[PDB]
Amino acid sequence: DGVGNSSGNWHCDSTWMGDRVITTSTRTWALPTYNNHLYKQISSQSGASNDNHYFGYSTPWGYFDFNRFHCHFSPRDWQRLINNNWGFRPKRLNFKLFNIQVKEVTQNDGTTTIANNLTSTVQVFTDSEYQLPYVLGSAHQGCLPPFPADVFMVPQYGYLTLNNGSQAVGRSSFYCLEYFPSQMLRTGNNFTFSYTFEDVPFHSSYAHSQSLDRLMNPLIDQYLYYLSRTNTPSGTTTQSRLQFSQAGASDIRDQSRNWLPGPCYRQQRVSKTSADNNNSEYSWTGATKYHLNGRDSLVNPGPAMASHKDDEEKFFPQSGVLIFGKQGSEKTNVDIEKVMITDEEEIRTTNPVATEQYGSVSTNLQRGNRQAATADVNTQGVLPGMVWQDRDVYLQGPIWAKIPHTDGHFHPSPLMGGFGLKHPPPQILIKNTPVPANPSTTFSAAKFASFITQYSTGQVSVEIEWELQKENSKRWNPEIQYTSNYNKSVNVDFTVDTNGVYSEPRPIGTRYLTRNL
Amino acid sequence: TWALPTYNNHLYKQISSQSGASNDNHYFGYSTPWGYFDFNRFHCHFSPRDWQRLINNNWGFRPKRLNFKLFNIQVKEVTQNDGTTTIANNLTSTVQVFTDSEYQLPYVLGSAHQGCLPPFPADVFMVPQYGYLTLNNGSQAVGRSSFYCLEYFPSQMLRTGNNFTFSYTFEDVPFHSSYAHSQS
Amino acid sequence: QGPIWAKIPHTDGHFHPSPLMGGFGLKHPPPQILIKNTPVPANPSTTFSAAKFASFITQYS
């Protein structure tokens, strides 16, 4: 309406209506002028090992991301969601940029004077056509903060393309973001846009109560026979005679079964107790990796597979699980106490244990003069009949990821967990329009370099509608729910401390309710 | 985005070659406080990929019509006292823009001058300053020479929050051949 | 990087009037657009004087 009329009203509430939930969240943001308004080509350092080479560009544009779950759900809201629903998925979203502020900083004489600049604008556009490299879903920093009070700084957009070591091959793409029409905003303007997700499978928020190996009736025997005993005693020396039996409660390991567990790419096992772990630098030499174009790249998290067998909560895969940092953790080489290691015991009923080999298979044709030998399989590709559980999603965890535009993707659900969308919410890019300082009275063709220093601030609000699959269990005994501890503590969980620092103490995964296979 | 200074301290000036200059290099004309827009270079409109798309695929092309817009106008004031420069908005002040649709002004376009809207979109450019040449006899100007006051032309005045748009349609012209003959 | 058009000179005779730099020789080319900041006068003297102003407020747009 006018310079002195607010663009929007602050919204943060979650409202539940039957099997639908709407979670709205509003944040204030600040956006600097990145790269001094210049596109830059960036690449790895000459020294960097060949596995670490890269080539790309850094852009003056800043983008919005809200791909972390806590951006939309509050701990209580999350509790309400997991305890009560078997499944959920995102339906549609609303996004708004309002109360835009552009300010000017005068830094002469060592004292900084900040004042409004009502005239200057911010360019915002959404890449609804996906002609830009998608940098979302790579678990980058800068999410709309978990806590509403906190103010956050908009991340800076950059992208990587093909490279031959330091050098860039002919095929590499350089994109000018400006080439895209972007709406320009002044103070007192707003930018809104709406998106509807594609139909996607509900993410299971349940943990199976029946293991795959155990699906049969304990009381009745099968009618199919298996090879019970290969040889039988003949006087003193045993003789080769084949004998068959019907599997029953007594020999459950032998029952015929229709289904097979999920695929397994094996991991290395490291323990939370320092003592167990070997005294050597095997962080990389001992890690599980894949190879693309001559570069070994660590496979983290990797295919969903249970982290540990029974009574081995102590162990966890080297790079087979998600690991979040406790609030205040620094960037490099933090101790174990400074992170939170996630735990996937729930999928063990149908998924293999990441550390253990998938199975055993016989590799030689036996005969009278040749014993029967078999070999372990550390890496099993999907075989017909397999069933598995996709990786869990956590409150601090990612929500979606763009399925790569390729001829073939199989079971394209992001390995970090989340919803694999073909057309994900478009990247939103915002940049302060550059404003030139006092120019020279005499003409000069060279481009400007003396811009007026500027920064812009304002509120951002994202609303998402989520559909729910209400729990319908007829189990008799009570189930397991998520509860905060009854005991007294110097700080309550999920709350600001004495100095006003919000902190998520533990990771919360969606699998507490249980259903049968 | 563009920036426009105050040329010639707001004064029309008569300019001519230097006394020393050889007779081939003499000229006489005027320099005006006005700055003009030019976009007569191809890269102003086409991006390298766009250009590639155009040449590979078409035998000929020509311009049909154009749309031009001046928006988000900003006028600022510089206070330079005490060696520290303070720049601040001046919402009241205006910019005069007019198009010479009647061609009563010497046409300085098409002479391959500098100042084109930059090839690259990110770059900010400085508006060129308008001047023109007329008849001359060595350093001196003959009676026939024309002095034009640009202000004599009605020009719309803009403030911050105003815009100026106008549209033009080219005349029919022959397509420029983008082919090379395969037969001598 | 080359030029797009050029104004055919207003003369009785031009033959094959296509600009030698290459481009499209138009009779009526896109009109020149001229833009100038309106001059703003600084604090004037309280006593009248017919001489024209010279103390303008420095400006850029």
Side-chain angles (χ1 to χ4, degrees), chain A residues 436-439, chain C residues 58-61:
Chain A
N438 53 338
Chain C
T58 301
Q59 272 181 355
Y60 83 87
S61 62

mmCIF file of all heavy atoms in Angstrom, chain A residues 436-439, chain C residues 58-61:
data_model
loop_
_atom_site.group_PDB
_atom_site.id
_atom_site.type_symbol
_atom_site.label_atom_id
_atom_site.label_comp_id
_atom_site.label_asym_id
_atom_site.label_seq_id
_atom_site.Cartn_x
_atom_site.Cartn_y
_atom_site.Cartn_z
ATOM 1 N N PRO A 436 25.165 2.351 -7.897
ATOM 2 C CA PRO A 436 26.445 3.019 -8.106
ATOM 3 C C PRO A 436 26.656 4.292 -7.303
ATOM 4 O O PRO A 436 25.748 5.094 -7.174
ATOM 5 C CB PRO A 436 26.410 3.380 -9.593
ATOM 6 C CG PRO A 436 25.227 2.689 -10.169
ATOM 7 C CD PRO A 436 24.270 2.521 -9.044
ATOM 8 N N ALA A 437 27.856 4.473 -6.774
ATOM 9 C CA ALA A 437 28.205 5.695 -6.074
ATOM 10 C C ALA A 437 28.474 6.809 -7.082
ATOM 11 O O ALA A 437 28.374 6.625 -8.296
ATOM 12 C CB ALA A 437 29.410 5.471 -5.169
ATOM 13 N N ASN A 438 28.819 7.986 -6.565
ATOM 14 C CA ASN A 438 29.095 9.169 -7.366
ATOM 15 C C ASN A 438 30.053 8.862 -8.506
ATOM 16 O O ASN A 438 31.211 8.496 -8.272
ATOM 17 C CB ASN A 438 29.662 10.279 -6.486
ATOM 18 C CG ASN A 438 30.847 9.818 -5.676
ATOM 19 O OD1 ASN A 438 31.024 8.624 -5.443
ATOM 20 N ND2 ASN A 438 31.671 10.764 -5.239
ATOM 21 N N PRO A 439 29.613 8.992 -9.747
ATOM 22 C CA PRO A 439 30.472 8.679 -10.888
ATOM 23 C C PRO A 439 31.286 9.893 -11.311
ATOM 24 O O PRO A 439 31.019 11.026 -10.913
ATOM 25 C CB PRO A 439 29.467 8.286 -11.976
ATOM 26 C CG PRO A 439 28.155 8.863 -11.539
ATOM 27 C CD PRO A 439 28.283 9.440 -10.172
ATOM 28 N N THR C 58 25.522 19.157 -6.437
ATOM 29 C CA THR C 58 26.076 18.042 -7.184
ATOM 30 C C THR C 58 25.117 16.880 -7.147
ATOM 31 O O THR C 58 24.627 16.521 -6.092
ATOM 32 C CB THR C 58 27.419 17.601 -6.606
ATOM 33 O OG1 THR C 58 28.331 18.701 -6.647
ATOM 34 C CG2 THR C 58 27.992 16.461 -7.408
ATOM 35 N N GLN C 59 24.876 16.269 -8.299
ATOM 36 C CA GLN C 59 23.944 15.159 -8.386
ATOM 37 C C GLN C 59 24.250 14.114 -9.406
ATOM 38 O O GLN C 59 24.915 14.372 -10.400
ATOM 39 C CB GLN C 59 22.588 15.684 -8.771
ATOM 40 C CG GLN C 59 21.807 16.072 -7.571
ATOM 41 C CD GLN C 59 20.430 16.584 -7.894
ATOM 42 O OE1 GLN C 59 20.072 16.744 -9.054
ATOM 43 N NE2 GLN C 59 19.648 16.852 -6.858
ATOM 44 N N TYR C 60 23.736 12.924 -9.156
ATOM 45 C CA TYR C 60 23.857 11.839 -10.102
ATOM 46 C C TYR C 60 22.602 11.002 -9.984
ATOM 47 O O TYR C 60 21.964 10.981 -8.947
ATOM 48 C CB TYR C 60 25.147 11.049 -9.915
ATOM 49 C CG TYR C 60 25.132 9.992 -8.853
ATOM 50 C CD1 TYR C 60 24.699 8.715 -9.136
ATOM 51 C CD2 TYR C 60 25.597 10.256 -7.582
ATOM 52 C CE1 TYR C 60 24.703 7.733 -8.173
ATOM 53 C CE2 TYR C 60 25.604 9.282 -6.614
ATOM 54 C CZ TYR C 60 25.156 8.024 -6.922
ATOM 55 O OH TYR C 60 25.158 7.046 -5.970
ATOM 56 N N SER C 61 22.221 10.337 -11.057
ATOM 57 C CA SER C 61 21.024 9.530 -11.021
ATOM 58 C C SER C 61 21.333 8.140 -11.515
ATOM 59 O O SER C 61 22.180 7.946 -12.373
ATOM 60 C CB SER C 61 19.922 10.163 -11.859
ATOM 61 O OG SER C 61 20.308 10.248 -13.210
#
